[PDB]
């Protein structure tokens, strides 16, 4: 009776965002960008002067985190307390704060019900780190999108250059190196692929190939 869910987990810069949107549109399903939740929580903490390195301080904020997401009128907008912060949550200051807040056990549990509420018919495409291992363990379809850290740093560099930002590959390689250690080195819902997850390594695959392989797999298990 419950709605089917396709989980897409993987490290930062693996291309989950792009894949999820493409699958959601292809199947006309709902989307959940769990990372945006942790980022909106982080931005909230910064604006409310809540200690980002304090589990006690963060828990209250997470439990009442006022965040809504708007459908695809073209893309997706993240709202915090009535204000669009879609761009601000994508800043390095918020990305860093987000990994900080997502590290605490009680803070993550305080966000479980909120993420799980996204499971609604006809289906949900869930993007994150632990969608297939903690949030939605029973997902009929689980995908682990991964790629070498070097490639993910290279793609990042290029995207920042497109936007007109001056970058340095060495810095980006360390940046993703540090994020990977966090998401993967924490006794609390670490980044690990589910045993039944399709491991999609996109290092030498194009956006088109990834989407094609993902949909082939998902459609296979759901019809
Ligand atoms: N399901 C998730 C999604 C995200 N995060 C953390 C990883 C860093 C931060 C932001 O994630 P993203 O870079 O994917 O926006 O939140 C997490 O712990 N669990």
């Amino acid at each position: 009776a419950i709605a089917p869910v396709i989980t897409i987990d993987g490290p930062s810069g693996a291309g989950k965002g792009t894949l999820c949107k493409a699958m959601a549109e292809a199947l006309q399903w709902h989307l959940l960008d769990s990372g945006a939740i942790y980022r909106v929580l982080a931005l909230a903490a910064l604006h409310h002067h809540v200690d980002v390195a304090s589990e006690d301080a963060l828990v209250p904020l997470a439990s009442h985190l006022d965040v809504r997401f708007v459908s695809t009128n073209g893309n997706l907008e993240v709202i915090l307390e009535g204000e669009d912060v879609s761009g601000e949550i994508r800043t390095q200051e918020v990305a860093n704060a987000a990994s900080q807040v997502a590290a605490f056990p009680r803070v993550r549990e305080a966000l479980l019900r909120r993420q799980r509420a996204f499971r609604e018919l006809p289906g949900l495409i869930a993007d994150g780190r632990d969608m297939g291992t903690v949030v939605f363990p029973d997902a009929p379809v689980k995908i682990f999108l991964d790629a070498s850290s070097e490639e993910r740093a290279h793609r990042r560099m290029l995207q920042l250059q497109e936007k007109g930002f001056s970058v340095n590959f060495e810095r980006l390689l360390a940046e993703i190196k540090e994020r990977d250690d966090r998401d993967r080195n924490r006794a609390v819902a670490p980044l690990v692929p589910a045993a039944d997850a399709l491991v999609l390594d996109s290092t030498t695959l194009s956006i088109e190939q990834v989407i094609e392989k993902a949909l082939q797999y998902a459609r296979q298990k759901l019809a």
Side-chain angles (χ1 to χ4, degrees), residues 1-24 26-92 94-169 171-176 178-207 209-223:
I2 205 66
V5 189
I6 292 168
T7 57
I8 297 170
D9 297 294
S12 182
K16 301 183 297 297
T18 303
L19 209 220
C20 295
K21 185 187 180 188
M23 295 192 78
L27 304 176
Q28 282 308 314
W29 280 18
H30 296 118
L31 166 67
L32 158 50
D33 175 353
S34 60
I37 295 177
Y38 288 97
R39 291 172 182 263
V40 181
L41 168 71
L43 176 58
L46 301 172
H47 282 191
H48 296 144
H49 292 27
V50 177
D51 187 348
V52 72
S54 169
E55 183 161 43
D56 286 335
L58 298 167
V59 173
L61 180 67
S63 296
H64 302 86
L65 185 61
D66 180 0
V67 187
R68 43 195 167 203
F69 308 70
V70 173
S71 298
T72 299
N73 211 298
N75 287 287
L76 191 156
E77 80 193 75
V78 191
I79 311 172
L80 174 54
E81 327 196 339
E83 302 295 344
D84 174 9
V85 296
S86 299
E88 188 164 3
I89 63 166
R90 299 304 174 184
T91 55
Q92 180 55 56
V94 172
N96 179 66
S99 78
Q100 276 193 299
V101 298
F104 303 102
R106 311 224 306 298
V107 172
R108 295 186 78 86
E109 305 182 72
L111 295 164
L112 286 181
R113 302 196 180 80
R114 181 178 284 89
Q115 295 166 85
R116 286 169 176 160
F118 278 71
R119 183 189 296 219
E120 194 182 305
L121 294 173
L124 174 69
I125 304 296
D127 164 7
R129 297 289 183 294
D130 63 328
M131 303 303 244
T133 53
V134 175
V135 185
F136 302 113
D138 60 309
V141 178
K142 300 188 184 71
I143 292 172
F144 193 80
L145 192 63
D146 197 8
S148 73
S149 61
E150 297 89 4
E151 172 67 27
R152 291 188 284 113
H154 202 159
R155 296 179 181 176
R156 269 266 60 178
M157 181 175 85
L158 290 161
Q159 288 186 54
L160 291 174
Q161 298 178 310
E162 187 192 308
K163 298 185 60 183
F165 285 67
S166 71
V167 288
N168 172 281
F169 176 80
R171 184 192 66 176
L172 292 176
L173 186 61
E175 174 66 43
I176 57 81
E178 70 187 3
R179 291 187 189 179
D180 295 341
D181 293 12
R182 299 166 189 171
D183 74 336
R184 195 176 300 171
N185 311 55
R186 69 185 184 207
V188 198
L191 179 69
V192 193
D196 52 326
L198 182 221
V199 181
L200 287 185
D201 189 297
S202 72
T203 302
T204 51
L205 298 177
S206 56
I207 297 174
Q209 303 188 89
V210 173
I211 297 171
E212 185 52 76
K213 297 178 174 296
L215 286 174
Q216 185 179 74
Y217 184 79
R219 285 166 179 155
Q220 164 59 295
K221 281 195 176 199
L222 303 159

